[PDB]
Design an enzyme around this catalytic site. Structure first.
Site, mmCIF file in Angstrom:
data_model
loop_
_atom_site.group_PDB
_atom_site.id
_atom_site.type_symbol
_atom_site.label_atom_id
_atom_site.label_comp_id
_atom_site.label_asym_id
_atom_site.label_seq_id
_atom_site.Cartn_x
_atom_site.Cartn_y
_atom_site.Cartn_z
ATOM 1 N N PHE D 32 46.147 37.147 37.430
ATOM 2 C CA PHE D 32 47.534 36.845 37.767
ATOM 3 C C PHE D 32 47.768 35.335 37.807
ATOM 4 O O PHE D 32 46.937 34.592 38.329
ATOM 5 C CB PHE D 32 47.876 37.467 39.125
ATOM 6 N N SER D 98 40.127 36.514 38.265
ATOM 7 C CA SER D 98 41.123 36.699 39.320
ATOM 8 C C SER D 98 41.410 38.176 39.584
ATOM 9 O O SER D 98 40.545 38.916 40.054
ATOM 10 C CB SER D 98 42.419 35.955 38.978
ATOM 11 N N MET D 99 42.635 38.588 39.273
ATOM 12 C CA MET D 99 43.052 39.979 39.403
ATOM 13 C C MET D 99 42.288 40.876 38.421
ATOM 14 O O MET D 99 42.129 42.076 38.643
ATOM 15 C CB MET D 99 44.570 40.092 39.200
ATOM 16 N N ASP D 228 38.069 26.933 45.619
ATOM 17 C CA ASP D 228 39.074 27.934 45.298
ATOM 18 C C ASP D 228 40.011 28.115 46.489
ATOM 19 O O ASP D 228 39.581 28.505 47.575
ATOM 20 C CB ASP D 228 38.403 29.259 44.927
ATOM 21 N N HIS D 257 40.775 27.518 41.555
ATOM 22 C CA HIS D 257 40.932 28.908 41.148
ATOM 23 C C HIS D 257 40.951 29.005 39.626
ATOM 24 O O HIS D 257 40.201 29.781 39.035
ATOM 25 C CB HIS D 257 42.205 29.516 41.740
#
Lengths: 438, 438, 438, 438
Positions: D32, D98-99, D228, D257
């Site tokens: 995302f 990430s997602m 992060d 991130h």
């Protein structure tokens, strides 16, 4: 009789051949510089034994056309291939002599052995004639062969008389093994060959066959004369025997190159014995393989023992009557109706003696397979494919993609009208039918 | 309702049959010279008990076709085979009577017991009726059976009234055990049979079944009447019992050959008792089968021995608490999460006491199978086929056409209280899940 | 087993039939008011003699459908036709009884005798039952038959017991020729027939067959009982014998209408004797006709005499070996290669004893016909047409429009794979081949 | 390029994807709120190493359709499945970010690892983000995530600039690791996503994956940045490493991130090293498989041992000169000319160093195949099918339905540079060529 195998400019390359007798096809490939008629002593013996003799003249020799191109073993094998494909031979025997042994070796190593049952090398060229640093087992350097080529273009006709002097060993065998009349004809045959062929043929003698030897997977026979002047025995058969130990090795004492005529009695005896031995081995190797699959459907009991002996008494060749067999097969307690049909189907293909019975009914009723409209239709799709098949392994693989009922119905097609297909292909269905019920 | 089992010329050999009720399939095979409707008193008791009654008419009798070929037990069994294959029965029950007892033995000795759970021989022909020098335990010589055949060919219809007189013992049971009307129907049935069947049937009575007896590996029941006139008890069941001692032996006192009707109350009682006993033996035999597949995922160690005990103490019916089992199953170091779910899934289906409490999560997280809608969709597609499925072999066969991921989610569906399939198909999933890890 | 022969509203008219045995097709047509099963004493005897018994139930009787339309001999013959066409019978035998004799007569007079070899009339209706001013040889006026019809609609079941009293002559034969059990079944069969059929069937008895009689060109057998009460012998067979003197006339003394059971021994003996005699006459009439054409190609000499005896020794049925014959045929001085093949072709079709020989080679080489590509193509166009042909005269006419070489090549097609076509058609080619070389 | 994975009303749910390169399939799943194009630095590195990069856009993001239903990991994994099944990947690598890491985890616990070789988790969500009473190791309470959803629904576009400020750590890395332009493109991608997707996506972040972790049986890689901000390392990767200790753990120091762009050099090195280890076990087993088929053409002998060594010394990557190899391959006595070409063809495909030089001639003459117009024609029909193929197992199966001469000629077309298929497909031809010569 001719077979078109090539094309040269405006002309077509045709090969003269002869087709005699019925039975196991035996291809006789002659050598330099004769024709197919030089097998006339071997031809007579093979026809009496019950074989099918097929002889042809190499391009540029005998009654065949005389081109000036395509004089190599890759082409020679291609010509042999074309002959075998056109005549459609199955499980045939390739017998070579002089140059002919090279054609046999090159064909097996290029086109496989789908059509070949056994091979025979009489006075072979194998493995190599050219004596180099890589192979000391040669007979002569290239300078020797080049002297021959120059000699032919000088006087091709005069070269023959001198060549045949060492071919039949006239200083040893004239008036004894071979008459003066026979020598004259051999000259005529060579003289009736291609002028360019006789000058190009020797350049094929020092061809390397070392790469072709290990592709021989069929029973072989290496035979050579001890008094061979053209092809020294120590430079050919001796090192060939080491390369292929499984091949039957036979030396004829005091035999010249043309031992086809001089020592005809010795060659004919040894050749017929090898064939009678080598083909018996495979005929039987399919029978025990079928017997293996057939017994794999019979439940263990006294009958599985009894069925094996009735088969063995047939496989050996002992006389047996079908009426007793077909009736005894009917009145069997442990066996299912389905397996009765399969056994009856085997019994008809295994005995030369049909006893004069049109056909049986209990098996036809057994081979129906419940009479399903969709199942009988899958039997005719198989039947068309089995006619195009040639080998045992080919027939088994195809007939393994169908249901057991389809195979039975397909066996029915073959049972009423055989055949079409052949016995080797016939067993392929049977071995597949018994394998599917497992 | 018909089942094609053969083929005769332009006509097809079809057999009439009936399929009633739901549950354990029970195949009832009638005897000479009646039909499937002669089981109507045994059928009624089986239908009330919750069984599945399947009766069919032998070729040449009842409503079945009337061919002139294939009147031997090998054909009779082959026809029987085709019937079992078409309906696709698993763990079914074979009950034979008169000639029907012969079909059960011959089927087991030729086609195995892959579909058979138990067998029953009512008024058997076993082991031999023909009295010879090799076997004195016969009932009569061949001259006797041939006299019956000659009597039938003389007047098959007149033969029936005399045949039924010793069949039901009319001098003892008429007006008592069996009315005259029921006898009238039995005559009509015999009269509506094949003329050739009635002439060929007696030649099958003196068939030797001694080689078929020890091939019986399923629970059997040998039952016979003491006052049997057609089949002397001393020449049949008495000598049959010696060959198969493991079979449950029950004698009905003063019962004739047609004891299916006369002593129906007695037969139904002994038969229902045999099934409740023999299948109880199999219910647990499926539990040990589950144990077989489940332990093939468990690593060799002390646990593989204890788990077998945790399964057996539950499979037998010994009282056990889930709290001890579910907690001890949870805190195991070597066992993977996947095998915990399978063990927990088995443990939930074999013990009746869940105590009416919450569900567990450690089994739920392994048997969830990650909860994916398309994976659950391959689980509901599985769930759709398993609710419609009835047998163990059927559930197993279906869930082998699905991915490994699909099986886990489907086991999750039954554990998570969504679905409600039968106990027999649930193990089919477990045995398939354990089959995939191999 | 059923054969759809018609259509009524929403339903389809199907007929029950049975097909047993292999050999010469013998069609047994039952009478009023029984079914095909009433031939059970005649069926057994015919099956032992080696015939192919085909029995069917007339529409409205037995196990066949029960329509309320199409109760006339024009329809009955049409039904018989449909049966014969569907089963595809060639050179069959039509045997009728009571009403069945009318179906045989009407079929021959409407559909010809292309499929018929011989006929038999047991207790016939021929030539006329209705006694009018035009035919005093009747048995009764229309007022009599109308009384019967009114009696059936009154109580069809009660009518049967009285009818069978005169059918088997129960006041004479009960307990003697026919048992009480056999009478009960005959009642059951009649009771299991169509209610409308039994009331419409008698209106077909007084049908005029005088126009159908002279169309009988095949060997016939007129048989009738002297004590026949239902069909007075003086009003049927006696005037029938005058109309067809060439037919074998046989009276059974003291035989009732249903002499099929009572005087079974007399009928079966006389019927088998007639068939064994009448079919032998035509089998031989084709052999001498073939022999006529075959000898018309052989040049006059000692061989034309020798060939005739070798044929006659075969035509009679004397044992002879083919190996000697085929070899003696080869080593023949006067005979051309072409005619050697034709003789060998005849010798294979004439002997039941094949001696267990696969096939011969000298004839295959003879039947080639110069191997012309256009000539072999004209042989396969013929071969497709001969399979569709049935009669001898049909095969000859077709194969007379082709060249002699084409016929030979066509004979080769039939020689390797026969057959397909049948022997009667096979001789048609031979007789045509020898006729073209003239 | 699109892949239909679902259905919403009148529209179809399609996902945009890319398929680049050849070798081990590596599926890159983005996070995302970016798209598949965010892997462009990893894609380039993977393509240079010789892998096959496959990236796709999640539903509601990037160039994929934007539905308003099915926003959960159970659906996300379901979408991934459809992609993997449609593309038919075998032994592929799932890499998440990430997602995206949740989808990899969610896929493995449901569909197994039959298609998966290894997995990689970059900036993972595992094991849990939601801080509850059951897991204090969470990253945030439910109130935090609900604040994000409300922030997005307020102004989704404005939310991005603030989100990307902590995604790449612009207060630390802007102008250094990542330019403002690269951020702008990242903004454009997020703005071109689904409005409903960005509001529903955060509700999937706090999904529990703890039950999915122990189902990971393939080599894994857990990587995470220390700086992060979006996903605190102590609440994610640190406790994730404890749940799966067998996974290779790698921390990138000072990485935000969005470390896919900022610390690409660091990521690419660690990812390629991880891939080089887990994939190497499979890389060598296919090379030996090629060696297996290649050695099946070499006759058993001392050379078969030397040729095996010549293959192994090349497959590993040891420097070797082609001139010595091609000459030693040429001057081989036992090897047939045909197999010389195949060995030379393999030797040419396995060494990157062509030296920017000429072609060889001994192989060109071997791969000619007698120069038959019909055999060479069957070679170009294969070449059209081989250009469209991608996998090794795919290339072999297709080129196994053609003749051996065609395969030789087809190998010739690609060798004489008249075509250009991939190395994996190239071996598919060789492995197909060697299987037919047996």
């Amino acid at each position: 009789p001719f077979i078109t195998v090539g094309q040269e400019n405006s002309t077509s390359i045709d090969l003269y051949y002869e087709d005699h007798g019925t039975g196991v096809p035996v291809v006789l490939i002659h050598g330099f510089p004769l024709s197919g008629h030089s097998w006339e002593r071997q031809s007579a013996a093979l026809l009496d034994a019950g074989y099918r003799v097929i002889t042809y003249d190499r391009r540029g020799f005998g009654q065949s056309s005389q081109p000036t191109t395509g004089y190599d073993y890759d082409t020679f094998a291609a010509d042999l291939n074309t002959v075998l494909e056109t005549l459609d031979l199955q499980d045939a025997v390739l017998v070579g002599f002089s140059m002919g042994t090279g054609e046999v070796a090159r064909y097996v190593s290029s086109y496989g052995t789908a059509r070949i049952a056994a091979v025979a090398f009489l006075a072979s060229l194998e493995p190599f004639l050219l004596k180099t640093d890589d192979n000391p087992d040669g007979a002569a350097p290239q300078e020797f062969f080049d002297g021959i080529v120059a000699a032919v273009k000088a006087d091709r006709y005069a070269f023959y008389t001198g060549f045949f002097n060492d071919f039949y060993n006239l200083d040893e065998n004239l008036g004894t093994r071979i008459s003066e009349e026979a020598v004259r004809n051999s000259w005529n045959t060579a003289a009736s060959g291609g002028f360019f062929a006789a000058a190009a043929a020797p350049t094929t003698w020092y061809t390397d066959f070392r790469a072709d030897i290990p592709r021989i997977d069929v029973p072989a026979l290496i035979l050579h004369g001890t008094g061979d002047r053209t092809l020294p025995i120590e430079n050919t058969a001796r090192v060939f025997h080491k390369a292929l130990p499984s091949a039957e090795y036979v030396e004829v004492e005091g035999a010249p190159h043309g031992l086809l005529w001089t020592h005809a009695e010795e060659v004919n005896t040894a050749l017929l014995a090898f064939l009678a031995k080598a083909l018996e081995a495979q005929k039987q190797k399919l029978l025990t393989e079928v017997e293996t699959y057939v017994l794999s459907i019979i439940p263990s009991g006294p009958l599985k023992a009894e069925i094996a002996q009735r088969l063995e008494d047939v496989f050996a060749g002992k006389n047996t009557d079908l009426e007793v067999l077909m009736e005894w097969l009917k009145t069997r307690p442990i066996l299912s109706p389905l397996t009765k049909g399969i056994l009856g189907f085997v019994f008809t293909l295994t005995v030369p003696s049909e006893r004069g019975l049109q056909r049986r009914r209990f098996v036809q009723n057994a081979l129906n397979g419940n009479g399903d409209p969709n199942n009988m239709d899958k039997a005719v799709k198989l039947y068309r494919k089995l006619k195009r098949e040639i080998t045992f392994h080919g027939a088994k693989e195809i007939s393994l993609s169908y249901s057991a009922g389809a195979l039975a119905s397909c066996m029915g097609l073959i049972y009423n009208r055989m055949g079409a297909v052949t016995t080797e292909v016939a067993f392929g269905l049977v071995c597949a039918t018994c394998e599917q019920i497992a």
